[PDB]
Design an enzyme around this catalytic site. Structure first.
Site, PDB file in Angstrom:
ATOM      1  N   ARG A  77       0.849  -1.166   0.000  1.00  0.00           N
ATOM      2  CA  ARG A  77       0.000   0.000   0.000  1.00  0.00           C
ATOM      3  C   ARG A  77       0.877   1.204   0.000  1.00  0.00           C
ATOM      4  O   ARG A  77       1.740   1.436   0.894  1.00  0.00           O
ATOM      5  CB  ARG A  77      -0.901   0.009   1.243  1.00  0.00           C
ATOM      6  CG  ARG A  77      -1.718   1.279   1.373  1.00  0.00           C
ATOM      7  CD  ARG A  77      -2.819   1.184   2.426  1.00  0.00           C
ATOM      8  NE  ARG A  77      -3.605   2.456   2.361  1.00  0.00           N
ATOM      9  CZ  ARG A  77      -3.461   3.473   3.210  1.00  0.00           C
ATOM     10  NH1 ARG A  77      -2.857   3.321   4.377  1.00  0.00           N
ATOM     11  NH2 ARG A  77      -4.007   4.612   2.948  1.00  0.00           N
ATOM     12  N   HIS A 121      -2.940  11.049  -0.271  1.00  0.00           N
ATOM     13  CA  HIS A 121      -2.377  10.916   1.087  1.00  0.00           C
ATOM     14  C   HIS A 121      -1.753  12.224   1.447  1.00  0.00           C
ATOM     15  O   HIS A 121      -0.566  12.269   1.865  1.00  0.00           O
ATOM     16  CB  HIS A 121      -1.503   9.676   1.178  1.00  0.00           C
ATOM     17  CG  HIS A 121      -1.313   9.144   2.539  1.00  0.00           C
ATOM     18  ND1 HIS A 121      -1.432   7.821   2.801  1.00  0.00           N
ATOM     19  CD2 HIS A 121      -1.025   9.728   3.736  1.00  0.00           C
ATOM     20  CE1 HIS A 121      -1.152   7.586   4.075  1.00  0.00           C
ATOM     21  NE2 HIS A 121      -0.899   8.736   4.655  1.00  0.00           N
ATOM     22  N   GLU A 166      -7.698   9.043   5.295  1.00  0.00           N
ATOM     23  CA  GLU A 166      -7.902   9.804   6.574  1.00  0.00           C
ATOM     24  C   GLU A 166      -8.327  11.260   6.340  1.00  0.00           C
ATOM     25  O   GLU A 166      -7.667  12.198   6.735  1.00  0.00           O
ATOM     26  CB  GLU A 166      -6.678   9.757   7.426  1.00  0.00           C
ATOM     27  CG  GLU A 166      -6.305   8.372   7.806  1.00  0.00           C
ATOM     28  CD  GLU A 166      -5.259   8.288   8.888  1.00  0.00           C
ATOM     29  OE1 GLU A 166      -4.745   9.364   9.204  1.00  0.00           O
ATOM     30  OE2 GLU A 166      -5.047   7.198   9.474  1.00  0.00           O
ATOM     31  N   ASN A 293      -7.789   2.396   9.363  1.00  0.00           N
ATOM     32  CA  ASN A 293      -6.491   2.692   9.981  1.00  0.00           C
ATOM     33  C   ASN A 293      -6.741   2.755  11.480  1.00  0.00           C
ATOM     34  O   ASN A 293      -7.529   3.598  11.941  1.00  0.00           O
ATOM     35  CB  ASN A 293      -5.865   3.979   9.498  1.00  0.00           C
ATOM     36  CG  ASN A 293      -5.411   3.973   8.062  1.00  0.00           C
ATOM     37  OD1 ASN A 293      -5.534   2.939   7.343  1.00  0.00           O
ATOM     38  ND2 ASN A 293      -4.967   5.173   7.609  1.00  0.00           N
ATOM     39  N   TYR A 295      -5.021   2.779  15.327  1.00  0.00           N
ATOM     40  CA  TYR A 295      -3.930   2.923  16.217  1.00  0.00           C
ATOM     41  C   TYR A 295      -4.269   2.924  17.703  1.00  0.00           C
ATOM     42  O   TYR A 295      -3.549   2.381  18.491  1.00  0.00           O
ATOM     43  CB  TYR A 295      -3.140   4.213  15.931  1.00  0.00           C
ATOM     44  CG  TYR A 295      -2.468   4.190  14.599  1.00  0.00           C
ATOM     45  CD1 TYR A 295      -1.141   3.774  14.516  1.00  0.00           C
ATOM     46  CD2 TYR A 295      -3.060   4.690  13.446  1.00  0.00           C
ATOM     47  CE1 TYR A 295      -0.499   3.727  13.285  1.00  0.00           C
ATOM     48  CE2 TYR A 295      -2.403   4.591  12.176  1.00  0.00           C
ATOM     49  CZ  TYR A 295      -1.157   4.157  12.125  1.00  0.00           C
ATOM     50  OH  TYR A 295      -0.539   4.139  10.882  1.00  0.00           O
ATOM     51  N   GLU A 352      -3.806   0.392   7.816  1.00  0.00           N
ATOM     52  CA  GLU A 352      -2.651   0.737   8.637  1.00  0.00           C
ATOM     53  C   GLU A 352      -2.848   0.256  10.070  1.00  0.00           C
ATOM     54  O   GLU A 352      -3.900   0.425  10.646  1.00  0.00           O
ATOM     55  CB  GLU A 352      -2.488   2.291   8.716  1.00  0.00           C
ATOM     56  CG  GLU A 352      -2.220   3.013   7.446  1.00  0.00           C
ATOM     57  CD  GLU A 352      -1.954   4.515   7.546  1.00  0.00           C
ATOM     58  OE1 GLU A 352      -1.640   5.014   8.659  1.00  0.00           O
ATOM     59  OE2 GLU A 352      -2.022   5.118   6.482  1.00  0.00           O
TER      60      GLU A 352
HETATM   61  O1  BGC Z   1       1.002   8.654  12.620  1.00  0.00           O
HETATM   62  C1  BGC Z   1       1.237   7.383  12.011  1.00  0.00           C
HETATM   63  C2  BGC Z   1       0.470   7.381  10.662  1.00  0.00           C
HETATM   64  O2  BGC Z   1      -0.866   7.698  11.047  1.00  0.00           O
HETATM   65  C3  BGC Z   1      -1.777   7.765   9.982  1.00  0.00           C
HETATM   66  O3  BGC Z   1      -2.705   8.768  10.535  1.00  0.00           O
HETATM   67  C4  BGC Z   1      -1.310   8.269   8.651  1.00  0.00           C
HETATM   68  O4  BGC Z   1      -2.062   7.727   7.523  1.00  0.00           O
HETATM   69  C5  BGC Z   1       0.188   7.992   8.361  1.00  0.00           C
HETATM   70  O5  BGC Z   1       0.620   8.767   7.236  1.00  0.00           O
HETATM   71  C6  BGC Z   1       0.902   8.393   9.643  1.00  0.00           C
HETATM   72  O6  BGC Z   1       2.287   8.184   9.436  1.00  0.00           O
END
Ligand code: BGC
Ligand code: BGC
Ligand code: BGC
Ligand code: GLC
Ligand code: NA
Length: 443
Positions: A77, A121, A166, A293, A295, A352
């Site tokens: 990706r 992006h 995003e 994505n 986190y 991600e």
């Molecule tokens: O912060 C870590 C990653 O977070 C995501 O919000 C983004 O798509 C990436 O470009 C960024 O590097």
């Protein structure tokens, strides 16, 4: 591996974005993006760095391919830089840009790596920003034009496409909170940007299907942050809901043909964009997949004094933290179960997931990033729970293939599964990378 096996046709990749890795900012007809302007603005980036060289992947993407293969990935990706394709944003094509990515796609496919291409992006051409950028409807039109041009050239080989990455970040961090390019600081401009982003997405989807030489699998990529109230008080629950609407539902709902969420509309009142029925119809253009994505979660406390959405994070010193975030793998299960049960998008990909650490080369030459290994193992365990629940997940991309320019944090914040030496440009696989290698191979 009982209970650990993923589907035999599962997509296994790593992810990057053009401005974060490519460098070669002035080469081969590339235009000026908002992140060129922002990185060269004093004090916008934490450490004085820019994307001017980054990982030099414009020249070095074959090295990147070598890493992907060493890892036994079956996909990559990456994004295409709009400034390389239409340098002025609205304007003539730059065929040298298209030809570069064409070569890169052929190289990937040759290597057994399916391209998962992100069109946007974050690297808006500056000339568009001069004309209000995502603050203007015209940018949506010309984004769709750009989507058309690219798919015309590459859509005989690339089936899987994402329009935006995003849009919450582009809109809110770029126009409201000022921490990302272009760096404005006005709520109404962020909300207007969100709408024009969404519109551009919808316009591009239709443009791409028309322009494509074969049927495509078109998605959009959203950051989702599962939100939990810190108590069951009305105040903390409402705060959770507002944060949830701010980040998640603001985008999910119009994409799902549900219009914007009315709680949020009413909450934003004057700052909310005017959203005619016609635009909402275009925004809900049918998708073939959704990218998630993931986190972190948000454990929300009411914060009446803070800026909108009036919700603060409540830190938990019992959960582990990385260099920059709290680790909460279970939130990935929760968010996927919500999408599976509550929304219409399917199949889903984890576009991600990854973490930043203070990675160093050890005496022996390796990078002993056990915390990143554990991060992958725990999130992949949650994905096995979600798949066992019926969630139609079709792949996983680790963010990032290699350490890179991490936006406002610069080169200082390392997210790679491979270590990048920014001075010599050498890449080295970290331990978590070898773990992914051997996990994927084992199956
Ligand atoms: O912060 C870590 C990653 O977070 C995501 O919000 C983004 O798509 C990436 O470009 C960024 O590097
Ligand atoms: O001052 C903003 C930035 O300008 C760029 O031209 C320099 O290369 C950076 O080191 C500096 O941080
Ligand atoms: O040929 C011009 C450029 O095209 C790119 O695709 C290559 O990666 C570069 O090394 C080269 O400078
Ligand atoms: O020293 C290991 C790492 O420490 C921290 O994250 C630093 O920001 C980074 O620049 C360095 O590479
Ligand atoms: Na920690």
């Amino acid at each position: 591996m009982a209970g650990e096996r993923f589907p035999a046709d599962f997509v296994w990749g790593a992810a990057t974005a053009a401005y974060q890795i490519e460098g070669a900012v002035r080469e081969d007809g590339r235009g000026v993006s908002i992140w060129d302007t922002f990185s060269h603005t004093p004090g916008k980036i934490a450490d004085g760095t820019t994307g001017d060289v980054a990982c030099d992947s414009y020249h070095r993407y074959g090295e990147d391919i070598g890493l992907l293969n060493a890892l036994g990935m079956n996909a990559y990706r990456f994004s295409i830089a709009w400034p390389r394709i239409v340098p002025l944003g609205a304007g003539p094509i730059n065929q040298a840009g298209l030809d570069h990515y064409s070569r890169m796609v052929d190289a990937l496919l040759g290597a057994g790596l399916q391209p998962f291409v992100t069109l946007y992006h974050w690297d808006l051409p500056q000339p568009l920003e001069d004309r209000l950028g995502w603050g203007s409807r015209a940018t949506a039109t010309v984004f769709a034009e750009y989507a058309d041009i690219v798919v015309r050239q590459l859509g005989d080989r690339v089936t899987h496409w994402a329009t935006l990455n995003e849009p919450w970040c582009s809109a809110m961090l770029g126009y409201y909170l000022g921490v990302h390019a272009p760096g404005h600081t006005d709520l109404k401009r962020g909300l207007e940007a969100s709408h024009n982003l969404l519109l551009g997405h919808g316009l591009a989807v239709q443009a791409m299907r028309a322009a494509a030489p074969q049927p495509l699998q078109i998605g959009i990529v959203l950051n989702l942050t599962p939100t939990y109230p810190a108590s069951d008080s009305p105040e903390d629950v409402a705060a959770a809901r507002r944060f949830d609407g701010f980040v998640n539902r603001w985008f999910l709902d119009p994409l799902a043909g549900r219009g914007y969420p009315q709680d949020m509309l009413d909450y934003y009142g004057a700052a909310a964009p005017q959203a005619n029925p016609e635009d909402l119809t275009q925004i809900a253009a049918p998708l073939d997949w959704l990218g998630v994505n993931y986190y972190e979660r948000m454990r929300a406390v009411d914060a009446p004094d803070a800026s909108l959405p009036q919700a603060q994070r409540l830190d938990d010193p019992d959960l582990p933290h990385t260099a920059d975030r709290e680790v909460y793998p279970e939130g990935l299960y929760d968010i996927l179960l919500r999408l599976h049960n509550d929304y219409p998008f399917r199949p889903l990909y984890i576009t991600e997931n990854g973490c930043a650490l203070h990675d160093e080369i050890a005496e022996d030459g390796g990078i002993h990033d056990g915390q990143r290994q554990a991060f992958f193992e725990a999130h992949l365990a949650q994905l096995q729970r979600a798949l066992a629940a019926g969630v139609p997940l079709k792949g996983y991309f680790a963010w990032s293939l290699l350490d890179n320019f991490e936006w406002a944090m610069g080169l200082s914040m390392r997210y790679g599964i491979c270590y990048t030496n920014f001075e010599t440009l050498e890449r080295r696989i970290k331990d978590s990378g070898y773990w992914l290698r051997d996990f994927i191979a084992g199956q």
